[PDB]
CSV table of C-alpha atoms and ligand atoms in Angstrom, one decimal:
chain,number,residue,atom,x,y,z
Y,1,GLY,CA,0.0,0.0,0.0
Y,2,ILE,CA,2.0,3.0,1.3
Y,3,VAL,CA,5.2,1.0,0.9
Y,4,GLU,CA,4.4,0.4,-2.8
Y,5,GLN,CA,3.2,3.9,-3.4
Y,6,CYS,CA,5.9,5.7,-1.3
Y,7,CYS,CA,9.0,3.5,-1.6
Y,8,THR,CA,8.8,2.8,-5.3
Y,9,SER,CA,8.6,6.6,-6.0
Y,10,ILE,CA,8.9,9.6,-3.8
Y,11,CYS,CA,5.6,10.6,-2.4
Y,12,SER,CA,4.8,14.3,-2.2
Y,13,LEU,CA,3.6,15.9,1.0
Y,14,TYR,CA,0.1,15.7,-0.4
Y,15,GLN,CA,0.4,12.0,-1.1
Y,16,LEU,CA,1.8,11.4,2.4
Y,17,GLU,CA,-1.1,13.4,4.1
Y,18,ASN,CA,-3.6,10.9,2.6
Y,19,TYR,CA,-2.3,8.4,5.2
Y,20,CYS,CA,-2.9,10.6,8.2
Y,21,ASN,CA,-5.9,10.1,10.5
D,1,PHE,CA,17.8,-6.2,0.0
D,2,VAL,CA,17.1,-3.9,3.1
D,3,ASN,CA,16.2,-1.0,0.9
D,4,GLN,CA,12.5,-1.1,1.6
D,5,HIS,CA,13.2,-1.4,5.4
D,6,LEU,CA,15.4,1.7,5.3
D,7,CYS,CA,12.8,3.5,3.1
D,8,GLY,CA,10.1,2.7,5.7
D,9,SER,CA,12.0,4.3,8.5
D,10,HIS,CA,12.2,7.6,6.5
D,11,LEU,CA,8.5,7.2,5.4
D,12,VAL,CA,7.3,7.0,9.0
D,13,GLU,CA,9.4,10.1,10.0
D,14,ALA,CA,7.8,12.0,7.1
D,15,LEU,CA,4.3,10.8,8.1
D,16,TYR,CA,5.0,12.0,11.6
D,17,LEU,CA,5.8,15.5,10.5
D,18,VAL,CA,3.0,15.7,7.9
D,19,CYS,CA,0.3,14.3,10.1
D,20,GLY,CA,1.1,16.2,13.4
D,21,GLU,CA,-1.6,15.8,16.1
D,22,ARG,CA,-3.7,13.7,13.8
D,23,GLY,CA,-1.2,10.8,13.9
D,24,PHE,CA,-1.4,8.0,11.4
D,25,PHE,CA,-1.6,4.2,10.9
D,26,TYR,CA,1.4,2.5,9.3
D,27,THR,CA,0.5,-0.9,7.9
D,28,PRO,CA,3.3,-2.0,5.6
D,29,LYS,CA,1.6,-5.0,4.0
T,1,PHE,CA,11.1,23.5,24.7
T,2,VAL,CA,9.4,21.3,22.1
T,3,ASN,CA,9.8,18.2,24.3
T,4,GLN,CA,6.8,16.2,23.2
T,5,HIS,CA,7.2,17.1,19.5
T,6,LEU,CA,10.8,15.7,19.3
T,7,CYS,CA,9.8,12.8,21.6
T,8,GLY,CA,7.1,11.8,19.1
T,9,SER,CA,9.6,11.7,16.2
T,10,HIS,CA,11.7,9.2,18.1
T,11,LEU,CA,8.7,7.2,19.2
T,12,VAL,CA,7.5,6.5,15.6
T,13,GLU,CA,11.0,5.3,14.7
T,14,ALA,CA,11.1,3.0,17.7
T,15,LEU,CA,7.6,1.7,16.9
T,16,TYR,CA,8.7,1.1,13.3
T,17,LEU,CA,11.6,-1.1,14.4
T,18,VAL,CA,9.8,-2.9,17.2
T,19,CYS,CA,6.5,-3.6,15.4
T,20,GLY,CA,8.1,-4.8,12.1
T,21,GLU,CA,5.5,-6.5,9.8
T,22,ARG,CA,2.7,-5.6,12.2
T,23,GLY,CA,3.1,-1.9,11.6
T,24,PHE,CA,1.6,0.4,14.3
T,25,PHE,CA,-0.7,3.2,15.1
T,26,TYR,CA,0.5,6.5,16.2
T,27,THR,CA,-2.4,8.3,18.0
T,28,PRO,CA,-0.9,11.1,20.1
T,29,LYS,CA,-4.2,12.9,20.8
N,1,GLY,CA,-1.6,7.3,25.4
N,2,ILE,CA,1.8,6.7,24.1
N,3,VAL,CA,2.9,10.4,24.6
N,4,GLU,CA,1.8,10.4,28.3
N,5,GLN,CA,3.3,6.9,28.8
N,6,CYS,CA,6.5,7.2,26.8
N,7,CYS,CA,7.5,10.8,26.7
N,8,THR,CA,7.3,11.1,30.5
N,9,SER,CA,9.7,8.1,31.1
N,10,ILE,CA,11.5,5.8,28.7
N,11,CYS,CA,9.2,3.0,27.6
N,12,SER,CA,10.6,-0.5,27.3
N,13,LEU,CA,10.3,-2.3,24.0
N,14,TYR,CA,7.5,-4.4,25.4
N,15,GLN,CA,5.7,-1.2,26.4
N,16,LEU,CA,6.1,0.1,22.9
N,17,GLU,CA,4.6,-3.1,21.4
N,18,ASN,CA,1.3,-2.2,22.9
N,19,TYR,CA,1.0,0.3,20.0
N,20,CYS,CA,1.7,-2.2,17.3
N,21,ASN,CA,-1.2,-3.3,15.1
W,1,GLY,CA,16.0,33.0,14.3
W,2,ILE,CA,14.6,29.5,13.4
W,3,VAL,CA,15.8,28.0,16.7
W,4,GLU,CA,14.1,30.7,18.8
W,5,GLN,CA,10.9,30.4,16.6
W,6,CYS,CA,10.6,26.7,16.3
W,7,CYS,CA,12.4,25.1,19.3
W,8,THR,CA,10.3,27.1,21.8
W,9,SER,CA,7.0,26.0,20.3
W,10,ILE,CA,6.0,23.8,17.4
W,11,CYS,CA,6.3,25.2,13.9
W,12,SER,CA,3.9,23.8,11.3
W,13,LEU,CA,5.3,22.6,8.0
W,14,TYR,CA,3.6,25.7,6.4
W,15,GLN,CA,5.5,28.0,8.8
W,16,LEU,CA,8.7,26.1,8.0
W,17,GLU,CA,8.0,26.8,4.2
W,18,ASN,CA,9.2,30.3,5.0
W,19,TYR,CA,12.8,29.0,5.3
W,20,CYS,CA,12.8,27.3,1.9
W,21,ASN,CA,14.7,28.9,-1.0
J,1,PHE,CA,22.4,23.9,25.0
J,2,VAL,CA,22.0,20.3,24.0
J,3,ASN,CA,18.2,20.7,23.5
J,4,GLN,CA,18.6,23.3,20.9
J,5,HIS,CA,21.3,21.2,19.1
J,6,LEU,CA,18.9,18.3,19.0
J,7,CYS,CA,16.1,20.5,17.8
J,8,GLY,CA,18.2,21.8,15.0
J,9,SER,CA,18.7,18.2,13.7
J,10,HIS,CA,15.0,17.8,13.5
J,11,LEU,CA,14.5,21.3,11.9
J,12,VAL,CA,16.8,20.3,9.0
J,13,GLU,CA,15.0,17.1,8.5
J,14,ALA,CA,11.7,19.0,8.4
J,15,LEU,CA,13.1,21.6,6.0
J,16,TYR,CA,14.4,18.8,3.7
J,17,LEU,CA,10.9,17.3,3.6
J,18,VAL,CA,8.9,20.5,3.2
J,19,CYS,CA,11.1,22.4,0.7
J,20,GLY,CA,11.5,19.5,-1.7
J,21,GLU,CA,13.1,20.7,-5.0
J,22,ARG,CA,13.3,24.3,-3.7
J,23,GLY,CA,16.0,23.4,-1.2
J,24,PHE,CA,16.8,25.5,1.8
J,25,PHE,CA,19.4,27.5,3.7
J,26,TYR,CA,19.9,26.6,7.4
J,27,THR,CA,21.6,28.8,10.0
J,28,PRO,CA,21.4,28.5,13.9
F,1,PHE,CA,14.5,8.6,-7.5
F,2,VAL,CA,14.0,7.1,-4.0
F,3,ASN,CA,17.7,6.3,-3.7
F,4,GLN,CA,18.7,10.0,-4.1
F,5,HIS,CA,15.8,11.1,-1.8
F,6,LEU,CA,17.0,9.0,1.1
F,7,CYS,CA,20.6,9.9,0.4
F,8,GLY,CA,19.7,13.6,0.7
F,9,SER,CA,18.0,13.0,4.1
F,10,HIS,CA,21.3,11.7,5.4
F,11,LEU,CA,23.3,14.4,3.7
F,12,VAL,CA,21.4,17.2,5.3
F,13,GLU,CA,21.9,15.6,8.7
F,14,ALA,CA,25.6,15.3,8.1
F,15,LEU,CA,25.8,18.9,6.9
F,16,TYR,CA,24.0,20.0,10.0
F,17,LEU,CA,26.6,18.4,12.2
F,18,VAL,CA,29.7,19.3,10.1
F,19,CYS,CA,28.8,22.9,9.5
F,20,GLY,CA,27.7,23.7,13.1
F,21,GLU,CA,27.4,27.4,13.7
F,22,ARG,CA,28.3,28.2,10.1
F,23,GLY,CA,25.2,26.7,8.7
F,24,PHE,CA,24.7,25.5,5.1
F,25,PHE,CA,22.8,25.6,1.9
F,26,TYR,CA,21.0,22.7,0.4
F,27,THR,CA,19.9,22.8,-3.2
F,28,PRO,CA,19.6,19.6,-4.2
X,1,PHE,CA,29.4,2.5,-1.4
X,2,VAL,CA,26.7,4.9,-0.3
X,3,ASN,CA,24.1,2.2,0.3
X,4,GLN,CA,26.3,0.5,2.9
X,5,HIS,CA,27.0,3.9,4.5
X,6,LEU,CA,23.3,4.6,4.9
X,7,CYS,CA,22.7,1.0,6.1
X,8,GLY,CA,25.2,1.6,9.0
X,9,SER,CA,23.4,4.7,10.1
X,10,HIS,CA,20.2,2.7,10.5
X,11,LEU,CA,22.0,-0.2,12.2
X,12,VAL,CA,23.4,2.1,14.9
X,13,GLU,CA,19.9,3.5,15.5
X,14,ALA,CA,18.5,0.0,15.9
X,15,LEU,CA,21.4,-1.0,18.2
X,16,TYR,CA,20.8,2.0,20.4
X,17,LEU,CA,17.2,0.9,20.7
X,18,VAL,CA,17.6,-2.8,21.4
X,19,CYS,CA,20.7,-2.6,23.5
X,20,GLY,CA,19.5,0.0,26.1
X,21,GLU,CA,21.9,0.6,29.1
X,22,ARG,CA,24.3,-2.1,27.8
X,23,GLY,CA,25.2,-0.1,24.7
X,24,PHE,CA,26.8,-1.7,21.8
X,25,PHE,CA,29.9,-2.2,19.6
X,26,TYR,CA,29.7,-1.0,16.1
X,27,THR,CA,32.6,-2.7,14.3
X,28,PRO,CA,31.9,-2.6,10.5
X,29,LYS,CA,35.3,-4.2,9.7
G,1,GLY,CA,30.3,-8.8,11.0
G,2,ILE,CA,27.1,-6.7,11.3
G,3,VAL,CA,27.4,-5.2,7.8
G,4,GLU,CA,27.6,-8.6,6.1
G,5,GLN,CA,24.8,-10.1,8.3
G,6,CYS,CA,22.4,-7.1,8.3
G,7,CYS,CA,22.9,-4.9,5.2
G,8,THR,CA,22.1,-7.6,2.7
G,9,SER,CA,19.0,-8.9,4.4
G,10,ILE,CA,16.8,-7.5,7.3
G,11,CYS,CA,18.0,-8.4,10.8
G,12,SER,CA,15.5,-8.5,13.6
G,13,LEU,CA,16.1,-6.6,16.8
G,14,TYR,CA,16.8,-10.0,18.4
G,15,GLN,CA,19.4,-10.7,15.8
G,16,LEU,CA,20.9,-7.2,16.3
G,17,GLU,CA,21.2,-7.8,20.1
G,18,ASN,CA,24.2,-10.0,19.3
G,19,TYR,CA,26.1,-6.7,18.9
G,20,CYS,CA,25.1,-5.3,22.3
G,21,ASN,CA,27.8,-5.1,25.0
P,1,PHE,CA,11.0,13.9,30.1
P,2,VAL,CA,13.3,11.8,28.0
P,3,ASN,CA,15.8,14.4,26.7
P,4,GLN,CA,18.9,12.5,27.9
P,5,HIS,CA,17.7,9.3,26.2
P,6,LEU,CA,17.0,11.2,23.0
P,7,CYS,CA,20.4,13.0,23.3
P,8,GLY,CA,21.9,9.4,23.2
P,9,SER,CA,20.1,8.6,19.9
P,10,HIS,CA,21.6,11.7,18.3
P,11,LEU,CA,25.0,11.1,19.9
P,12,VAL,CA,25.4,7.6,18.3
P,13,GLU,CA,24.4,9.0,14.9
P,14,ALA,CA,27.1,11.6,15.3
P,15,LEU,CA,29.6,9.0,16.4
P,16,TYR,CA,28.7,6.9,13.4
P,17,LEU,CA,29.4,9.9,11.1
P,18,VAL,CA,32.7,10.8,12.8
P,19,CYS,CA,34.2,7.5,13.4
P,20,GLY,CA,33.5,6.1,9.9
P,21,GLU,CA,34.9,2.6,9.5
P,22,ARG,CA,36.9,3.1,12.8
P,23,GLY,CA,33.6,2.1,14.5
P,24,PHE,CA,33.1,2.8,18.2
P,25,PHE,CA,31.8,1.3,21.4
P,26,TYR,CA,28.9,3.0,23.0
P,27,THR,CA,28.8,2.5,26.7
P,28,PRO,CA,26.1,4.9,28.1
P,29,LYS,CA,26.8,4.1,31.8
B,1,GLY,CA,26.2,19.2,-6.9
B,2,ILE,CA,26.2,17.4,-3.5
B,3,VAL,CA,23.8,14.6,-4.6
B,4,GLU,CA,25.8,13.9,-7.7
B,5,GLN,CA,29.1,13.9,-5.8
B,6,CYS,CA,28.0,12.4,-2.5
B,7,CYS,CA,25.4,9.9,-3.4
B,8,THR,CA,27.1,6.9,-5.0
B,9,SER,CA,30.6,7.2,-3.4
B,10,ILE,CA,30.8,8.2,0.3
B,11,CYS,CA,31.8,11.8,0.9
B,12,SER,CA,34.2,12.4,3.9
B,13,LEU,CA,33.4,15.0,6.6
B,14,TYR,CA,36.1,17.1,5.0
B,15,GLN,CA,34.5,16.8,1.6
B,16,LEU,CA,31.1,17.7,3.1
B,17,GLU,CA,32.7,20.7,4.8
B,18,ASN,CA,33.0,22.2,1.3
B,19,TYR,CA,29.2,22.6,1.3
B,20,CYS,CA,29.1,24.7,4.5
B,21,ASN,CA,28.6,28.5,4.3
R,1,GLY,CA,31.6,9.2,30.3
R,2,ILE,CA,30.3,10.2,26.9
R,3,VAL,CA,26.7,10.9,28.1
R,4,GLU,CA,27.8,13.0,31.0
R,5,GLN,CA,30.3,14.9,28.7
R,6,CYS,CA,28.1,15.4,25.6
R,7,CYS,CA,24.5,15.4,26.7
R,8,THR,CA,25.3,18.1,29.2
R,9,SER,CA,27.3,20.3,26.8
R,10,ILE,CA,27.4,20.0,23.0
R,11,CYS,CA,30.5,18.1,21.9
R,12,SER,CA,31.9,19.2,18.5
R,13,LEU,CA,32.6,16.5,15.9
R,14,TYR,CA,36.3,16.9,16.8
R,15,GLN,CA,35.5,16.3,20.4
R,16,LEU,CA,33.3,13.4,19.5
R,17,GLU,CA,36.2,12.0,17.5
R,18,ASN,CA,37.9,11.6,20.8
R,19,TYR,CA,35.4,8.7,21.5
R,20,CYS,CA,36.1,6.7,18.3
R,21,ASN,CA,38.0,3.5,18.1
L,101,RCO,O1,8.2,8.6,-0.6
L,101,RCO,C1,8.8,9.0,0.5
L,101,RCO,C2,9.6,8.0,1.2
L,101,RCO,C3,10.3,8.4,2.3
L,101,RCO,C4,10.2,9.7,2.7
L,101,RCO,C5,9.5,10.7,2.0
L,101,RCO,O2,9.4,12.0,2.4
L,101,RCO,C6,8.8,10.3,0.9
L,102,RCO,O1,10.0,6.3,25.7
L,102,RCO,C1,10.6,6.4,24.5
L,102,RCO,C2,10.6,7.5,23.7
L,102,RCO,C3,11.2,7.6,22.5
L,102,RCO,C4,11.9,6.5,22.0
L,102,RCO,C5,12.0,5.3,22.8
L,102,RCO,O2,12.6,4.2,22.3
L,102,RCO,C6,11.3,5.2,24.0
L,103,RCO,O1,9.1,23.2,15.7
L,103,RCO,C1,9.7,22.2,15.1
L,103,RCO,C2,11.0,21.8,15.6
L,103,RCO,C3,11.6,20.7,14.9
L,103,RCO,C4,11.1,20.0,13.8
L,103,RCO,C5,9.8,20.4,13.4
L,103,RCO,O2,9.2,19.8,12.4
L,103,RCO,C6,9.1,21.5,14.0
L,104,RCO,O1,19.1,-5.3,8.8
L,104,RCO,C1,18.9,-4.0,9.3
L,104,RCO,C2,19.6,-2.9,8.7
L,104,RCO,C3,19.4,-1.6,9.2
L,104,RCO,C4,18.5,-1.4,10.3
L,104,RCO,C5,17.8,-2.5,10.8
L,104,RCO,O2,16.9,-2.2,11.8
L,104,RCO,C6,18.0,-3.8,10.3
L,105,RCO,O1,28.2,10.5,0.9
L,105,RCO,C1,27.4,10.6,2.0
L,105,RCO,C2,26.0,10.4,1.8
L,105,RCO,C3,25.2,10.6,3.0
L,105,RCO,C4,25.8,10.9,4.2
L,105,RCO,C5,27.1,11.0,4.3
L,105,RCO,O2,27.7,11.4,5.5
L,105,RCO,C6,28.0,10.9,3.2
L,106,RCO,O1,27.0,16.7,22.2
L,106,RCO,C1,26.2,16.1,21.3
L,106,RCO,C2,25.1,15.4,21.6
L,106,RCO,C3,24.4,14.7,20.6
L,106,RCO,C4,24.7,14.9,19.3
L,106,RCO,C5,25.8,15.7,18.9
L,106,RCO,O2,26.2,15.8,17.6
L,106,RCO,C6,26.6,16.3,19.9
L,107,ZN,ZN1,15.8,14.0,18.5
L,108,ZN,ZN1,18.2,6.2,5.6
């Protein structure tokens, strides 16, 4: 999930924020 | 390789700063 | 001083290492 | 919570595991 | 400076944007 | 003191994250 | 690339420590 | 090799965590 | 040594404990 | 507070950087 | 730049010092 | 020791070098 999205390519701040509560 | 393991450590520190008081769930698989 | 803010940064890294494949939830508030 | 428990005193690794999924 | 502003209380990432080039 | 030194480490990490391709200048 | 991104994180931390009071610029 | 350099940084962090008051020896050879 | 054991595949914290004093 | 504990985390990262392949022992007590 | 120089072969503290103000 | 010396006052990288092997 996040590991595939954010460790294959650099996630932007926006993309990261999707994972917050 | 350990690349993904090392990446995850940076990922969680970034999530910490982005999310602030909201916090987050980290569920790697 | 920003005690709890810097503490949290370390906490998530520790949780990352301890929890491994389980992942974790960081819910400060 | 974790901040009250683990920013006041050092939490053991077993204490930290309470917050694993 | 940044240490007086952001080590005495929490700076948001938006506040921190001010220090970017 | 040591607190401010530790804080600065975290500041640079945050600036790295937030500034992205813009980069940043850091000074204590 | 992710490689370079993670490298940069460590570089800025190293620069923080090496440069001390002088500070530093990061560009990447 | 930069990958090994970055690996060692993360190893030292994990040693600090798991070893506690014992501390550790980081001897990369 | 640690680099050979733990930079090529992931070592658990228990595995890493072999390097504590 | 846990500032001394967190100081240690930063200290070992700095030792890692400075010592290079010299390595180091960390004996917190 | 620093990424180019520093990011495949390891840069020494001396080498990094070149990037300070 | 190192904690007493360097968590009470900031040790420079040179001073920290004093604790290497
Ligand atoms: O995609 C990522 C991975 C790690 C840190 C980060 O800021 C972004
Ligand atoms: O109580 C704590 C706080 C931060 C990191 C850690 O391992 C324990
Ligand atoms: O106020 C601060 C201090 C250090 C890091 C950070 O993201 C915010
Ligand atoms: O195998 C490893 C390498 C680096 C950090 C870690 O926790 C485990
Ligand atoms: O070449 C490098 C890359 C990252 C950190 C460092 O100290 C050196
Ligand atoms: O005195 C210290 C304590 C922690 C990190 C560091 O670079 C110096
Ligand atoms: Zn810290
Ligand atoms: Zn890393």
